[PDB]
Amino acid sequence: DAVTIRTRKVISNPLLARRQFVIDVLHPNRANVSKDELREKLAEIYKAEKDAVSVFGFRTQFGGGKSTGFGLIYQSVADAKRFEPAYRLVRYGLAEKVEKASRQQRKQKKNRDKKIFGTQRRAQKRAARRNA
Amino acid sequence: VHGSLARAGKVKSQTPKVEKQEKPKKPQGRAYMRLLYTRRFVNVTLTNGKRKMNPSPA
Amino acid sequence: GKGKPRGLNSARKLRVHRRNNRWADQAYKARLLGTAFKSSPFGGSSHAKGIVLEKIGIESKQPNSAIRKCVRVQLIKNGKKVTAFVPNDGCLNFVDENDEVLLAGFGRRGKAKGDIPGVRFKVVKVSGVSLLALWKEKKEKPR
Amino acid sequence: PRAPRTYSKTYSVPKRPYESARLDAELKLAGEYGLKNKREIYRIGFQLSKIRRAARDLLTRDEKDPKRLFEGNALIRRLVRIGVLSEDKMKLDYVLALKPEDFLERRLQTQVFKLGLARSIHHARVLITQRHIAVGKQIVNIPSFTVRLDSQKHIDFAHNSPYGGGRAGRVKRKNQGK
RNA sequence: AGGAUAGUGGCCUACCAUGGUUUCAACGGGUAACGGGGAAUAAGGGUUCGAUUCCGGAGAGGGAGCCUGAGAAACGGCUACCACAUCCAAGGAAGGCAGCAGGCGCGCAAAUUACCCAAUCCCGACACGGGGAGGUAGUGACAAUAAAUAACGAUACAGGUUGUAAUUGGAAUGAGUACAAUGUAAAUACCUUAACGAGGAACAAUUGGAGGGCAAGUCUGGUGCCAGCAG
Numbered sequence: 118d119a120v121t122i123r124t125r126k127v128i129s130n131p132l133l134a135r136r137q138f139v140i141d142v143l144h145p146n147r148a149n150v151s152k153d154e155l156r157e158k159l160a161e162i163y164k165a166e167k168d169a170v171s172v173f174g175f176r177t178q179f180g181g182g183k184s185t186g187f188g189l190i191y192q193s194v195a196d197a198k199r200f201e202p203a204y205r206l207v208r209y210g211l212a213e214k215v216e217k218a219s220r221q222q223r224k225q226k227k228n229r230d231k232k233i234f235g236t237q238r239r240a241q242k243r244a245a246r247r248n249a
Numbered sequence: 250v251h252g253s254l255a256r257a258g259k260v261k262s263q264t265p266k267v268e269k270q271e272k273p274k275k276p277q278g279r280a281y282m283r284l285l286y287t288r289r290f291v292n293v294t295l296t297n298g299k300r301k302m303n304p305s306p307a
Numbered sequence: 308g309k310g311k312p313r314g315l316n317s318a319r320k321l322r323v324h325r326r327n328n329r330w331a332d333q334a335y336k337a338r339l340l341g342t343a344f345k346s347s348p349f350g351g352s353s354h355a356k357g358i359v360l361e362k363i364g365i366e367s368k369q370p371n372s373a374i375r376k377c378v379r380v381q382l383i384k385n386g387k388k389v390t391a392f393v394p395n396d397g398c399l400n401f402v403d404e405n406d407e408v409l410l411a412g413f414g415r416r417g418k419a420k421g422d423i424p425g426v427r428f429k430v431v432k433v434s435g436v437s438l439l440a441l442w443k444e445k446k447e448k449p450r
Numbered sequence: 451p452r453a454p455r456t457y458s459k460t461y462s463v464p465k466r467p468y469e470s471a472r473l474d475a476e477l478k479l480a481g482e483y484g485l486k487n488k489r490e491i492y493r494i495g496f497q498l499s500k501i502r503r504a505a506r507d508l509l510t511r512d513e514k515d516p517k518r519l520f521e522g523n524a525l526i527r528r529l530v531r532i533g534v535l536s537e538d539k540m541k542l543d544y545v546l547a548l549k550p551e552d553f554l555e556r557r558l559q560t561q562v563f564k565l566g567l568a569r570s571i572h573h574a575r576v577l578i579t580q581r582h583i584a585v586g587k588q589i590v591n592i593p594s595f596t597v598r599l600d601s602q603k604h605i606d607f608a609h610n611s612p613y614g615g616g617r618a619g620r621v622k623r624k625n626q627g628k
Numbered sequence: 629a630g631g632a633u634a635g636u637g638g639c640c641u642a643c644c645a646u647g648g649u650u651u652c653a654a655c656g657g658g659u660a661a662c663g664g665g666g667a668a669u670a671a672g673g674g675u676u677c678g679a680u681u682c683c684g685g686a687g688a689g690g691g692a693g694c695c696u697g698a699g700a701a702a703c704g705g706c707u708a709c710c711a712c713a714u715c716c717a718a719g720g721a722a723g724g725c726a727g728c729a730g731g732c733g734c735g736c737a738a739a740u741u742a743c744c745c746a747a748u749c750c751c752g753a754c755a756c757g758g759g760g761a762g763g764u765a766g767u768g769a770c771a772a773u774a775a776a777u778a779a780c781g782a783u784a785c786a787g788g789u790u791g792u793a794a795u796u797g798g799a800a801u802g803a804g805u806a807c808a809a810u811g812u813a814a815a816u817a818c819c820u821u822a823a824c825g826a827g828g829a830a831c832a833a834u835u836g837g838a839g840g841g842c843a844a845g846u847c848u849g850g851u852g853c854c855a856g857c858a859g
């Protein structure tokens with residue numbers, strides 16, 4: 118209801134081929150909209166694609182209503198993929214959260230490779246022959 | 250007339266036991282300040298320059 | 308006049324003279340002799356735990372006449388034997404031989420309090436629970 | 451590790467705990483401003499006391515002195531802005547006359563009481579606490595929130611208040627239907 | 629004068645001289661002594677504290693000796709002894725939490741064997757890998773800031789224009805539970821918010837006191853210099 122998008126402190130960022138500014142939502146009678154919704158409104162306002170828009174860090178003033186945030190308007194999915202981290206892309210869907218094990222499991226494996234010199238196959242076959 | 254360790258707890262033991270009385274709770278916080286401010290400066294009960302705050306019933 | 312040196316170059320005399328005479332100040336002398344660390348029953352702490360060795364009743368000093376209920380205690384940390392006092396009518400019955408009590412001073416800084424001869428500490432807890440709760444039955448003695 | 455965060459205290463209890471005169475005066479102030487406890491009196495005493503220590507030291511200095519003028523004028527303006535001082539009292543010598551009855555006027559509890567928003571100052575406190583008040587376009591829930599002159603004009607019911615336009619509340623929505 | 633050192637120097641050697649410090653406190657002994665920036669209190673002058681977020685030093689069970697390397701007398705490097713201590717088929721082998729978390733002990737006295745490289749910066753052949761450094765959660769009444777436990781009206785009452793002692797109602801609300809977004813590396817929490825959430829609003833405030841110092845009773849029972857209180 119009467120959602121408005123208000124921008125200040127705009128930096129044209131060619132080094133990362135993007136653009137940095139601050140984004141304010143003026144929404145009454147509502148909790149707040151999802152970040153993705155601000156991405157579609159930013160897209161419609163600035164006639165850029167959805168995947169070239171990224172926003173983050175939204176906080177509302179005391180008393181409800183108005184919220185601030187920070188957003189990036191890239192100039193391709195290619196650019197928004199070149200200059201961006203994995204967690205934002207997993208948020209949107211432009212990537213996938215890689216299925217690594219836990220930190221303890223990975224560290225324990227890496228320490229467990231410190232007890233073998235040379236290739237794993239060599240040790241495996243050697244131990245198999247000695248366990249006959 | 251002496252004592253010893255045997256008579257320990259005598260008076261607290263033989264005190265007739267009386268329970269505390271159910272009574273309305275008093276306000277906690279700034280309402281208690283309201284109550285004191287009235288009883289001391291609004292409903293003052295001055296007695297010829299002798300203000301008693303726990304006068305015995307007599 | 309006044310019997311102290313006033314000269315502009317007399318600082319060493321004044322400083323050493325003050326240093327000598329602070330030894331007559333009991334607080335300063337206790338602190339710099341390390342008496343609390345080397346001779347106090349608690350070794351300089353605020354509280355100490357112990358084991359009850361017996362019970363004792365001590366006749367109060369004049370002009371009072373009563374029997375103060377006190378326990379003989381040996382401390383865990385150093386094995387010293389101290390006499391503590393249990394407050395609150397009906398709490399000598401909460402302490403038994405070979406119980407572990409927690410002690411504290413009477414607030415007079417190593418001196419005796421009141422009409423109680425030669426007693427310097429008060430029992431705070433017994434068997435891990437405070438005497439204030441056992442007296443008011445908020446808790447019961449675990450055995 | 452990371453650098454420490456600075457913090458401090460905002461009150462100091464009196465050296466004498468039981469003075470009949472001081473106790474009576476503090477109860478009078480609490481009743482006249484509907485305060486929660488004496489620490490709110492203590493805070494005014496503390497902050498006015500450091501103001502007066504600094505400002506006394508300034509008044510002990512000479513006029514036209516950059517330390518003197520700069521700090522004194524800054525203090526004077528920070529005092530006039532909040533409504534502790536008025537328009538004709540920018541001299542640095544009227545601040546010493548200031549009283550805990552002054553700083554306690556500027557609270558939102560007192561201001562909500564003074565301009566008809568509440569039936570009593572206790573009502574004013576429970577309206578601020580229960581979030582029915584608004585200072586300008588910012589909703590305020592802190593009774594000790596000090597109002598300058600600029601926000602003196604801008605105190606009203608919350609834009610979404612049951613008393614300022616919006617769905618009334620639980621007791622209404624549970625009783626009016628029947 | 630040489631030797632050694634990266635280099636000065638009794639740093640060490642040879643020969644020689646007999647010097648060097650001290651009541652202006654040497655030397656020796658104590659330290660419940662790492663130093664400092666600082667902290668607490670503070671009319672002024674002072675007193676007391678500083679293991680500990682930054683800087684400097686030192687140590688890695690105790691001692692010593694070395695390798696490598698620009699740089700270590702390094703201990704999450706080696707070597708040996710001492711003390712502890714693990715495995716063993718008895719021939720042998722393997723150790724160093726004053727890193728993080730966790731156990732035992734000690735005591736008056738102090739928290740989870742959690743998540744992560746997203747920030748801070750560091751290292752490497754490196755835009756990419758790694759970082760218990762660090763960051764996020766759990767425990768957390770060490771301290772510090774703000775701050776609910778209620779409020780408003782009416783009857784006859786009471787009283788000299790309201791300041792009135794009770795019980796009659798309409799309302800308001802967040803403590804909490806929970807649609808959703810946000811927050812975030814992912815979360816949690818805060819902030820924002822659907823449906824909920826108070827008359828004994830039992831959604832019930834505590835700790836100490838009432839002879840004086842020192843604020844607040846000579847009211848009722850119990851005891852009877854006993855039991856207890858009492859700085």
Ligand SMILES: CN[C@@H]1[C@@H](O)[C@@H](O[C@@H]2[C@@H](O)[C@H](O[C@H]3O[C@H]([C@@H](C)O)[C@@H](O)[C@H](O)[C@H]3N)[C@@H](N)C[C@H]2N)OC[C@]1(C)O
Binds near residue numbers: 323327330653
């Ligand atoms: C055993 N108690 C001693 C008590 O005897 C006395 O000690 C003095 C001491 O103050 C004197 O010494 C003192 O004064 C001299 C001054 C002459 O310069 C100083 O040089 C010296 O450092 C200083 N400690 C010393 N000369 C004799 C002791 N008995 O005062 C100090 C004390 C520790 O209380």
